[PDB]
Design a protein around this ligand. Sequence first.
Ligand SMILES: [Mg+2]
Lengths: 88, 49
Amino acid sequence: ISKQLPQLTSLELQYVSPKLLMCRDLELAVPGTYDPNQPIIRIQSIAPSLQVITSKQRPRKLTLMGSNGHEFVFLLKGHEDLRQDERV
Amino acid sequence: MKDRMKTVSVALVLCLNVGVDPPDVVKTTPCARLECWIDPLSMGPQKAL
Ligand SMILES: [Mg+2]
């Protein structure tokens, strides 16, 4: 395994999450935004593949397309308690 | 068929070096470079070979 993780790269959703690859217009809002005083952008779709960043840890660079066509970029990652960050 | 000469062995000479673009060629965005229906330029050279 240690001799294959360095060769790790961008991953396609077909092989890790067929359900998300088939995901289309939901009732959900874009995760990072909710304004009750303004219209809510609905999740339109997600990218076919994610990009793996290389370090001691390996976050994943997710792209997401909203109902307005705007693209939003996020870092997916584990081993973390982000509640402290929300409070800060 | 008095001639019965059969083939016995096969040599697979894969001279291609993954990720190296010779000066002879200038590619374009739709240069799908599938070989054996398998295009892991993403995975890096060793997995590809
Ligand atoms: Mg994360």
